[PDB]
Design a protein around this ligand. Structure first.
Ligand SMILES: *[C@@H]1O[C@H](CO)[C@@H](O[C@@H]2O[C@H](CO)[C@@H](O)[C@H](O)[C@H]2NC(C)=O)[C@H](O)[C@H]1NC(C)=O
Ligand code: FE
Ligand code: FE
Ligand code: NA
Length: 303
């Protein structure tokens, strides 16, 4: 009988441009590649890994950019009723992030109830559950655009950062699901221009290790990377919806052997990741906007 499966696309840093035509050729190519993937292989939902609207987000919930950069761009019929689950990046927080949360009630497929939140999924016709914790790494660690270094040196509100961290610790300690995923804009590990996010390495990584998280999904660096540590924890970096950056500036800031796949060709149109979860395993497939498949690897069921 048909294998039970939950499928989703994880695209990051897709948020167009504030000048006409409010998209890039890369966003357009990825919206069409995503449509082909959902049409042929299927998607239960799409996960945005932040930087939803370059370069200063939206002003309010009626901002025209919602139509120009998001709705009209991802408009192939095959994407019509695919829910999106959203989190925010640094450029979103240069603007009005409550506007993006409030847009949840304007557009059906846009789901973004709060800066951070938990998603729960059962795989159909199985007892296998999936948990996804959507983080706001900007309020946890600070806006990278607030610093010349562009590395978030500290959060702007101590109570918020502490509150969200206590929330993560609690949720992760009690999460009994078969696969547990954590997502946020900033990378834990990354070999590229931004590199590892010290705040997440020091505060988030230990929790991911203690509670046996399946994978951490992120964007922020504008390319595609798979990383994996000695404990089997996977790092899915998908930040190539709009830009492609071949930098390897931080290659030796990531522990030796972590990097398992990297693609950042400056002339590529970008890409995204395709996650398939069965009772057997979780698979991640990196797909170039050219429709090409670049890399596939598997992560085991937890506890
Ligand atoms: C941030 O955005 C929120 C969401 O739009 C703003 O609150 C709304 O402001 C709009 C202005 O276009 C009003 O028309 C709405 O009535 C408000 N929301 C609702 C649900 O009624 C908020 O003012 C913005 N904060 C800023 C710009 O500092
Ligand atoms: Fe970005
Ligand atoms: Fe970013
Ligand atoms: Na909605």
């Amino acid at each position: 009988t048909p294998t039970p499966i939950l499928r989703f696309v994880a695209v990051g840093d897709w948020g167009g441009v504030p000048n006409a035509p409010f998209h890039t050729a890369r966003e357009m190519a990825n919206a069409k590649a995503i449509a082909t993937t959902v049409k042929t292989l299927g998607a239960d939902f799409i996960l945005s890994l932040g930087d939803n609207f370059y370069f200063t987000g939206v002003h309010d919930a009626k901002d025209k950019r919602f139509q120009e950069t998001f709705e009209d761009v991802f408009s192939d019929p095959s994407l019509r009723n695919v829910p999106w689950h959203v989190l925010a990046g640094n450029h979103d927080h240069l603007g009005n992030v409550s506007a993006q949360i409030a847009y949840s009630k304007i557009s059906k497929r846009w789901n973004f109830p709060s800066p951070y939140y938990r998603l729960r999924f059962k795989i159909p016709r199985s007892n296998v559950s999936v948990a996804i914790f959507m983080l706001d790494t900007v309020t946890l660690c600070g806006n990278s655009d607030d610093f010349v270094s562009q590395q978030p040196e500290r959060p702007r509100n101590l109570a918020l950062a502490r509150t969200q961290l206590a929330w993560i610790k609690k949720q992760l300690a009690a999460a009994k699901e078969d696969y547990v995923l954590v997502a946020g804009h900033y990378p834990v590990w990354s070999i590229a221009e931004h590199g590892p996010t010290h705040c997440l390495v020091k505060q988030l990584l230990p929790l991911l290790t203690t509670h046996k998280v399946t994978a951490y999904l992120c964007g922020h660096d504008h390319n595609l990377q798979y990383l994996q540590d000695e404990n089997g924890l996977g790092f899915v970096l998908s930040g190539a919806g709009n830009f492609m950056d071949p930098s390897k500036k931080h290659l030796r800031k990531v522990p030796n052997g972590y990097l398992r796949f990297h693609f950042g060709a400056e002339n590529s149109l970008g890409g995204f990741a395709y996650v398939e979860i069965t009772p057997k395993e979780m698979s991640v497939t990196y797909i170039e906007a050219s429709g090409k498949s670049l890399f596939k690897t598997k992560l085991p069921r937890r506890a």
